[PDB]
Enzyme design. Structure first.
Site, PDB file in Angstrom:
ATOM      1  N   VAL A  16       2.647   2.385  -5.969  1.00 35.63           N
ATOM      2  CA  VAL A  16       1.617   1.757  -4.992  1.00 35.63           C
ATOM      3  C   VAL A  16       0.580   0.776  -5.734  1.00 35.63           C
ATOM      4  O   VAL A  16       0.394   0.665  -6.876  1.00 35.63           O
ATOM      5  CB  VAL A  16       0.751   2.865  -4.571  1.00 35.63           C
ATOM      6  CG1 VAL A  16      -0.294   2.558  -3.795  1.00 35.63           C
ATOM      7  CG2 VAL A  16       1.841   4.059  -3.852  1.00 35.63           C
ATOM      8  N   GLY A  17      -0.026   0.075  -4.778  1.00 33.67           N
ATOM      9  CA  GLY A  17      -0.952  -0.996  -5.451  1.00 33.67           C
ATOM     10  C   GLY A  17      -2.121  -0.938  -4.403  1.00 33.67           C
ATOM     11  O   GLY A  17      -2.061  -0.332  -3.572  1.00 33.67           O
ATOM     12  N   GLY A  20      -1.072  -3.199  -1.511  1.00 31.84           N
ATOM     13  CA  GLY A  20       0.216  -2.672  -0.985  1.00 31.84           C
ATOM     14  C   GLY A  20       1.299  -1.900  -1.703  1.00 31.84           C
ATOM     15  O   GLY A  20       1.056  -2.227  -3.245  1.00 31.84           O
ATOM     16  N   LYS A  37       7.227  -6.374  -3.198  1.00 31.33           N
ATOM     17  CA  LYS A  37       5.597  -5.975  -3.086  1.00 31.33           C
ATOM     18  C   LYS A  37       5.013  -6.297  -1.767  1.00 31.33           C
ATOM     19  O   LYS A  37       4.876  -7.291  -1.487  1.00 31.33           O
ATOM     20  CB  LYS A  37       4.947  -6.507  -4.424  1.00 31.33           C
ATOM     21  CG  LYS A  37       3.439  -6.243  -4.489  1.00 31.33           C
ATOM     22  CD  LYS A  37       2.743  -6.728  -5.773  1.00 31.33           C
ATOM     23  CE  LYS A  37       1.361  -6.353  -5.738  1.00 31.33           C
ATOM     24  NZ  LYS A  37       0.698  -7.011  -6.954  1.00 31.33           N
ATOM     25  N   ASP A 131      -3.967  -6.683 -17.954  1.00 26.25           N
ATOM     26  CA  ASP A 131      -3.911  -5.346 -17.409  1.00 26.25           C
ATOM     27  C   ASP A 131      -2.695  -4.819 -18.414  1.00 26.25           C
ATOM     28  O   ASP A 131      -2.473  -3.806 -18.082  1.00 26.25           O
ATOM     29  CB  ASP A 131      -3.317  -5.514 -16.405  1.00 26.25           C
ATOM     30  CG  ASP A 131      -3.482  -4.079 -15.456  1.00 26.25           C
ATOM     31  OD1 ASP A 131      -4.223  -3.261 -15.982  1.00 26.25           O
ATOM     32  OD2 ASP A 131      -3.092  -3.907 -14.370  1.00 26.25           O
TER      33      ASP A 131
HETATM   34  C1  LIG Z   1      -2.711   1.782   2.178  1.00 23.99           C
HETATM   35  C2  LIG Z   1      -1.925   0.589   2.885  1.00 23.99           C
HETATM   36  C3  LIG Z   1      -1.283  -0.434   2.314  1.00 23.99           C
HETATM   37  C4  LIG Z   1      -0.658  -1.424   2.939  1.00 23.99           C
HETATM   38  C5  LIG Z   1      -0.483  -1.304   4.531  1.00 23.99           C
HETATM   39  O1  LIG Z   1       0.163  -2.224   5.095  1.00 23.99           O
HETATM   40  C6  LIG Z   1       1.546  -2.086   5.202  1.00 23.99           C
HETATM   41  N1  LIG Z   1       2.045  -0.915   4.903  1.00 23.99           N
HETATM   42  C7  LIG Z   1       3.605  -1.559   5.239  1.00 23.99           C
HETATM   43  C8  LIG Z   1       4.643  -0.804   5.064  1.00 23.99           C
HETATM   44  C9  LIG Z   1       5.912  -1.463   5.534  1.00 23.99           C
HETATM   45  C10 LIG Z   1       7.356  -0.658   5.447  1.00 23.99           C
HETATM   46  C11 LIG Z   1       8.346  -1.209   4.744  1.00 23.99           C
HETATM   47  C12 LIG Z   1       9.707  -0.464   4.537  1.00 23.99           C
HETATM   48  C13 LIG Z   1       9.668   0.778   5.247  1.00 23.99           C
HETATM   49  C14 LIG Z   1       8.584   1.274   5.850  1.00 23.99           C
HETATM   50  C15 LIG Z   1       9.128   2.411   6.418  1.00 23.99           C
HETATM   51  C16 LIG Z   1      10.150   2.804   5.712  1.00 23.99           C
HETATM   52  N2  LIG Z   1      10.732   1.587   5.095  1.00 23.99           N
HETATM   53  C17 LIG Z   1      12.101   1.662   4.429  1.00 23.99           C
HETATM   54  C18 LIG Z   1       7.477   0.699   5.937  1.00 23.99           C
HETATM   55  C19 LIG Z   1       6.133  -2.672   6.008  1.00 23.99           C
HETATM   56 CL1  LIG Z   1       7.585  -3.463   6.547  1.00 23.99          CL
HETATM   57  C20 LIG Z   1       4.721  -3.419   6.337  1.00 23.99           C
HETATM   58  C21 LIG Z   1       3.407  -2.775   5.814  1.00 23.99           C
HETATM   59  N3  LIG Z   1       2.112  -3.164   5.663  1.00 23.99           N
HETATM   60  C22 LIG Z   1      -1.155  -0.140   5.049  1.00 23.99           C
HETATM   61  C23 LIG Z   1      -1.853   0.724   4.293  1.00 23.99           C
HETATM   62  C24 LIG Z   1      -2.339   2.022   4.987  1.00 23.99           C
HETATM   63  O2  LIG Z   1      -3.553   1.589   5.694  1.00 23.99           O
HETATM   64  N4  LIG Z   1      -1.474   3.197   5.539  1.00 23.99           N
HETATM   65  O3  LIG Z   1      -1.903   3.585   6.722  1.00 23.99           O
END
Ligand SMILES: Cc1ccc(Oc2nc3cc(-c4ccc5c(ccn5C)c4)c(Cl)cc3[nH]2)cc1C(=O)NO
Ligand SMILES: Nc1ncnc2c1ncn2[C@@H]1O[C@H](COP(=O)(O)O)[C@@H](O)[C@H]1O
Ligand SMILES: Nc1ncnc2c1ncn2[C@@H]1O[C@H](COP(=O)(O)O)[C@@H](O)[C@H]1O
Ligand SMILES: Nc1ncnc2c1ncn2[C@@H]1O[C@H](COP(=O)(O)O)[C@@H](O)[C@H]1O
Lengths: 435, 168, 299
Positions: A16-17, A20, A37, A131
């Protein structure tokens, strides 16, 4: 349907980052694995790094080096930015040491040479990782070190220092935990020393559950040297872990150290320690990845003429001055002591007031960024252009303070006058008043 | 080519089953892949307008945090415009953007003109400067009514330390 | 040619060292202080900057120090008033009342063929390299710098036949209109010869015309280093006694020696000229770097 970006099928979360998560991916045809990433665009707007992210992408994508994680592609979507990077299956070096304990001398040296090669490559390109630690050093199947997570890195600018709080306390240099200004290559070297210690001893040189005690241990620079350690590498550790950044080992020093030189492959450091070009270096370039990769004839030719220029030793004194038999003909017949800016033993508030009234006396425009930092601009009465300089008050000692003058590059096209001389004349007017 | 542009549809919440229905798939039910509280499908979409809705545990709904369009029939769909500027990385980042005196760093105490050089080389030559020392002003104590200023600047891979002799 | 085309290919930037020092004088500076500054910083020439015009006007060299001394020297019993009380701008006004000379400079992106041509055309030993964008003077280009660059970075082969041709057959150098001084010749007289003939160095000869020493323009700056400039009545031999402790005999060459041998000797010795001598050291002429570079560019 599945989650697929750039023909890669997104798998389990590697890590985790702040912006993202990092997720493994697998090519739908070849089965090739990459690390993706995911950067959420609304998150990089919330805390505004948008320019910093833009820069990190530029530099990391230009990087090529075996022991730094390669950035293959950056895929943009409306909601998200996808960074496709190489994937190494060995995971963190930290986890490897946790499981297998301390590495022996030859394996510790093998990995440390690879890591320092990557650190050197970053510094040649004017990038500081900031880092560095076993958590950010990955491993492939063959146990090759891979430097990752440049999120906290920075691009070094001429005449600038970095005061930004970075990384972790255990791997942070004494000047970093003290909040002092630093150049930043010396900070990566300190972190590399802790990595080297962790490789050899399987433990951290500075660690305490009590945070104030830990910060004192780091600033004292006192760490335990186990009996099984080679005295040679102990001397190397003592030099890298020097509290004084001016006494701290450089990468040039480490390359010269006998413990580091043993068994060292040539692909790790194909270039001279200097970060500035030499007449001999350009010569090869004029004659028209290879240096860091396994040897190729085009790469081989480079070393050939470099080694040919070295054996004679007759061309080096031309391009640069050595600091310490036959005196140079023009140096025979011919002491002024230079100093930085101007010093004052008065109060910081009083000397800032004297500066401000003198800036006004010279009809200069100035903006206050910090109580001790000023940005001054002067309009040239002849060329009708502007000359910029930045002022910073520093503390030399208990009773002594120093006013620092620094030139600021303009954005102008070819312009009348001399940018350097115009900077001098602008300072000259202020110094004449303050003196 | 430009007719396939990757677009992320992400539903944040819990569910046993989450489907995506839109104008692009002819309002069929596309199952979303779950990763904890996120359900995601990545679709390559043609440029222009698309309307979509989610099916979450048997309930048709829309994302309240995403743009919506309300039909004259009372239908509420999420709406997304696929635009070229989002798929160029640096174009996407272009639109996204729109006390005591600090202790003197010891680096600046390295004075290139105070450094002595071997007698066997050109007196005009100097050692290689540290990049943090560049652009900083160095000076001599004013004597004989003359003030001397100096600074080291960089020209591509080369460095020039310039001395200026000016009277007071 | 091998050398002619080489100079056409490379840029002045290639000759600029990694880290170098450059002294710049404001034209309002006391001219005596400027010549002392050249000694302090170990620099033979400096660009002149006019704060009024905000431009580089010209160059201050040791030749100007020679011109001032010869012009205003009266005796050792009276100070040179103009040398002390003049400003760089004030003597520049005296030096060229009707004649007008501009600043000869060159861009760092210009070739070496351009740089060598500029040095020859204007009869100058100092060519400042000035960046047209920033307006900053990067470096001061010299004959000595260029030839050493040619020697280091050019392979011997292919080797033109002209390199193995003797100095006499090539007719390189000046074997007529010689400018020399006797061992007893006063410094003031030597300065006058510098002014009239405008040559870089004067071979010091004995009664028989054999060269026992050499007095160049650079050696004159030692008068400012020792602050002996107010006594010019001393001989050139006494003026050259300062270098006596570590000096090798005057560098010479013979008419039967090849051009390559002479170029190698000059680059190794890092001097501007050789004295052409016969077997008894009698002076037959002078081969300088300006003679060599004019031969390499023309051919
Ligand atoms: C903490 C946080 C960090 C980043 C964030 O934004 C995104 N998260 C993502 C997850 C995914 C993603 C990628 C692959 C996946 C899933 C499912 C299966 N697989 C295999 C979700 C995508 Cl394609 C875009 C995203 N954008 C949202 C949050 C956040 O607030 N979480 O609610
Ligand atoms: N780049 C230049 N521009 C203008 N005048 C120069 C330049 N270089 C040398 N001079 C002048 O030419 C004369 C001979 O100087 P030198 O180059 O030492 O032979 C002196 O009067 C110098 O000031
Ligand atoms: N002592 C001298 N007597 C006569 N001519 C000279 C002397 N020294 C140099 N020259 C000539 O003056 C020209 C310029 O050379 P230099 O002054 O050494 O740059 C060349 O043609 C030289 O041959
Ligand atoms: N042919 C030569 N023989 C001996 N000394 C020389 C010769 N040419 C130049 N020098 C010396 O080199 C120094 C600088 O000369 P230049 O830079 O050529 O004017 C002075 O000390 C000169 O006396």
């Amino acid at each position: 349907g599945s989650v697929k970006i750039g023909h890669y099928i997104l798998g389990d979360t590697l890590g985790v980052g702040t912006f993202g998560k990092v997720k493994v991916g697998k090519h739908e045809l070849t089965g090739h694995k990459v690390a993706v990433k995911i950067l959420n665009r609304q998150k990089i707007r919330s805390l505004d790094v948008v320019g910093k992210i833009r820069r990190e992408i530029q530099n990391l994508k230009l990087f090529r080096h075996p022991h730094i994680i390669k950035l293959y592609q950056v895929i943009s979507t409306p909601s998200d930015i996808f960074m496709v990077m190489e994937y190494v299956s060995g995971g963190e070096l930290f986890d490897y040491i946790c499981k297998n304990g301390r590495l022996d001398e030859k394996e510790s040296r093998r990995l440390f040479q690879q890591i320092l090669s990557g650190v050197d490559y970053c510094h040649r390109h004017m990038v500081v990782h900031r880092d560095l630690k076993p958590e950010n050093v990955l491993l492939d199947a063959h146990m090759n070190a891979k430097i990752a997570d440049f999120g906290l890195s920075n691009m070094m600018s001429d005449g600038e220092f970095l005061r930004t709080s970075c990384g972790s306390p255990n791997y942070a240099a004494p000047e970093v935990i003290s909040g002092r200004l630093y150049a930043g290559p010396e900070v990566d070297i300190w972190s590399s020393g802790v990595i080297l210690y962790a490789l050899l001893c399987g433990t951290l040189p500075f660690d305490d559950d009590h945070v104030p005690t830990l910060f004192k241990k780091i600033c004292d620079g006192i760490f335990y040297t186990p009996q099984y350690l080679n005295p040679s590498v102990i001397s190397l550790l003592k030099h890298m872990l020097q509290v004084d950044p001016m006494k701290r080992a450089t990468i040039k020093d480490i390359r010269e150290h006998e413990w580091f030189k043993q068994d060292l492959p040539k692909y790790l450091f194909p270039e001279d320690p200097s970060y500035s070009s030499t007449m001999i270096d350009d010569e090869a370039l004029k004659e028209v990845l290879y240096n860091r990769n396994h040897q190729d004839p085009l790469a081989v030719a480079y070393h050939l003429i470099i080694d040919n220029r070295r054996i004679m030793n007759e061309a080096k004194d031309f391009y640069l001055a050595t600091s310490p038999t036959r005196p140079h003909p023009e140096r025979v017949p011919f002491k002024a002591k230079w100093h930085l800016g101007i010093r004052s033993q008065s109060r910081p508030n009083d000397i800032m007031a004297e500066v401000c009234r003198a800036i006004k006396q010279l009809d200069y425009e100035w903006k206050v960024v910090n109580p001790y930092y000023l940005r001054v601009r002067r309009k040239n009465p002849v060329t009708s252009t502007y000359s910029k300089m930045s002022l910073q008050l520093y503390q030399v000692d208990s009773r002594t303070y120093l006013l620092d003058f620094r030139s600021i590059d303009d954005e102008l096209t070819p312009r009348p006058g001399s940018h350097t001389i115009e900077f001098f004349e602008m300072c000259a007017n202020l110094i004449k008043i303050l003196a | 080519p430009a007719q396939a542009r990757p677009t992320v549809f992400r539903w944040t919440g819990g569910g046993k089953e989450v489907y995506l229905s839109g104008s692009f798939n002819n309002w069929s039910k596309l199952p979303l892949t779950r990763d904890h509280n996120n359900f995601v499908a990545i679709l390559d979409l043609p440029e222009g307008e698309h309307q979509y809705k989610f099916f979450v545990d048997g309930q048709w709904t829309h994302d309240p945090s995403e743009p919506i369009v309300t039909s004259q029939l009372g239908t509420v769909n999420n709406i997304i415009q696929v635009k070229k500027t989002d798929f160029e990385v640096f174009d996407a980042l272009m639109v996204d953007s729109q006390r005591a005196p600090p202790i003197l760093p010891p680096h600046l105490l390295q004075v290139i003109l105070n450094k002595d050089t071997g007698i066997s080389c050109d007196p005009a030559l100097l050692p290689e400067p540290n990049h943090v020392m560049l652009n900083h002003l160095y000076a001599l104590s004013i004597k004989d009514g003359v003030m001397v200023l100096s600074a080291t600047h960089r020209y591509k891979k080369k460095y020039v330390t310039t001395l200026l002799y000016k009277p007071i | 040619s091998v050398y002619t085309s080489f100079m056409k290919s490379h840029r002045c930037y290639d000759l600029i060292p990694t880290s170098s020092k450059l002294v710049v004088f404001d034209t309002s500076l006391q001219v005596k202080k400027a010549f002392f500054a050249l000694v302090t910083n170990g620099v033979r020439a400096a660009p002149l900057w006019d704060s009024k015009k905000q431009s580089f006007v010209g160059m201050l060299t040791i030749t100007d120090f020679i011109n001032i001394l010869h012009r205003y020297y009266k005796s050792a019993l009276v100070q040179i008033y103009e040398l002390e009380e003049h400003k760089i701008e004030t003597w520049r006004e005296v030096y060229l009342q009707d004649s007008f000379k501009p600043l000869v400079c060159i861009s760092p992106n210009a070739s070496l063929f351009d740089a060598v041509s500029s040095l020859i055309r204007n009869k100058i030993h100092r060519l400042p390299v000035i960046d047209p964008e920033s307006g900053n003077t990067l470096y001061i280009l010299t004959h000595k710098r260029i030839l050493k660059f040619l020697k280091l970075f050019i392979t011997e082969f292919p080797k033109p036949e002209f390199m193995s041709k003797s100095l006499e057959e090539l007719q390189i150098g000046t074997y007529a209109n010689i400018a020399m001084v006797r061992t007893t010749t006063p410094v003031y007289v030597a300065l006058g010869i510098f002014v009239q003939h405008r040559v870089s160095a004067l071979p010091v000869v004995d009664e028989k015309g054999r060269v026992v020493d050499i007095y160049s323009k650079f050696d004159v700056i030692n008068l400012a280093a020792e602050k002996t400039y107010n006594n010019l009545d001393v001989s050139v031999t006494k003026a050259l006694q300062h270098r006596s402790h570590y000096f090798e005999g005057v560098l010479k060459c013979y008419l039967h020696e090849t051009l390559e041998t002479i170029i190698n000797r000059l680059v190794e010795a890092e001097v501007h000229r050789l004295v052409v001598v016969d077997e008894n050291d009698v002076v037959k002429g002078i081969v300088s770097l300006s003679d060599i570079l004019q031969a390499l560019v023309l051919t």
